[PDB]
C-alpha cells in the first residue's frame, strides 16, 4: 500500500507556551504539484509525534470540519480516492492540530486538509 504519515513537531513566563515548531510535514508533498493523492487501492493513515511529548504536554488531531478523525481513515471506509495536503482544499474539510501546554490551555498549530472523491471506490488500511 501507501503510507500517509503526518509528522507533528514542536520545541517548547509560560516558557513552553508558543512552541515554534513548524516541521509539520507530509510524505513527498510537493505543494505546487498538488495534494498527495492516493493512487494505490490501499493506504495506511499514520500519525507521528516528533514533538517531545513531555509529561506536561500532549497533542491531538480531532477535526470538526471533517467526518472522520485521523486514524478512523485506517478503518475500512467508503472512499473513491483521497488526497492529503497541508494547504486548503476547496470543497473539502480541515483538521486542527491543537497543542496543550497542559489540560489548562490549548492552541492550534497547523491544519490537515484532505480531498475526497465519490462513493466507495477505494478503502483504507489499518495495518
Amino acid at each position: 500500500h501507501t503510507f500517509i504519515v503526518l509528522y507533528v513537531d514542536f520545541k517548547p513566563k509560560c516558557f513552553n507556551c508558543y512552541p515554534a515548531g513548524v516541521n509539520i510535514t507530509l510524505a513527498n508533498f510537493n505543494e505546487t504539484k498538488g495534494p498527495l493523492c492516493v493512487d494505490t487501492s490501499h493506504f495506511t493513515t499514520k500519525y507521528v509525534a516528533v514533538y517531545a511529548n513531555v509529561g506536561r504536554w500532549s497533542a491531538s488531531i480531532n477535526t470538526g470540519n471533517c467526518p472522520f478523525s485521523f486514524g478512523k481513515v485506517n478503518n475500512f471506509v467508503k472512499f473513491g480516492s483521497v488526497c492529503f495536503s497541508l494547504k486548503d482544499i476547496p470543497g473539502g474539510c480541515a483538521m486542527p492540530i491543537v497543542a496543550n501546554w497542559a489540560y489548562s490551555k490549548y492552541y492550534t498549530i497547523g491544519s490537515l486538509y484532505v480531498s475526497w472523491s465519490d462513493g466507495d471506490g477505494i478503502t483504507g488500511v489499518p495495518q
Epitope: 498538488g34 492516493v38 480531498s115 465519490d118
Partner: antibody, heavy 123, light 102 residues
Amino acid sequence: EVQLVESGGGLVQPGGSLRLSCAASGFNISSSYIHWVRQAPGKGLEWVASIYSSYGYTYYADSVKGRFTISADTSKNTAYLQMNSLRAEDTAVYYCARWWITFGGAGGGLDYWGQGTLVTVSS
Amino acid sequence: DIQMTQSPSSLSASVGDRVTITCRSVSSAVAWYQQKPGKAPKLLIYSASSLYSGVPSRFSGSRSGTDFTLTISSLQPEDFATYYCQQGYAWRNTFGQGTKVR
C-alpha cells in the same frame, strides 16, 4: 447567461508573447477552478494549466511550466493566460474551462467549456 | 505522477453496435467527454460513476481494478464524436490518445 468566453488569440512570431482572456458570466470564477486545454490541429486534447482564482492556486503542466503563466481578476470575473517564448509545438486552439468540485475535494470534473480560440506560431 | 493509455484510437462501427472505449496506479477520479471536430467538447461522465443531468443514458462508465471503461448501449447517428478519457483531480488534467467514432 452562463458563458465562458475565450479571446485574445491570433498569429504570433517565434518566441513571441500573447495573452488569452477567459471571461465568464452566469457564475463567479473564484467559486470554481478554471483550466486551460490546448488542442493541436489534427491532434487530441493536451493538458495545460489550471487555477483556483479565489485562493490563487496556480497549477501547471509538464511542458508549459516555465513559459506560460496563469492569473485571474475576480473583480473582472476573468481568467488570463500569458504565453511567452512560443514554438510550433504550442500553436493550437486553446479552450478555457470550468472545473466544479464534488461535495468532497476531488472535484466532479471539468464542467463547462468555451468555443476556444486558435493561436498560430508562425513567421 | 501517473499516465493514461487509451485504445483503440479509431473505432468505426455501425448503428446499434456497442462501442467499448477503455483506458488504463489509478482511483475513482476519471471522466469521459465527446467532441465534434473543431467544436467544443461536453462533459459526459465524471468520476466513472454517474452522468451529467441531461446526458443520454446510453453512455455508461465504470471501472474494474486499473481499467476504466465507457460503453454506449445503442449507438445513435448523433453519437459521432472523438471520445476522450481524462484522469486526475481539480488541479491535474491528463488525457489519452483519443478514440474516434453505414
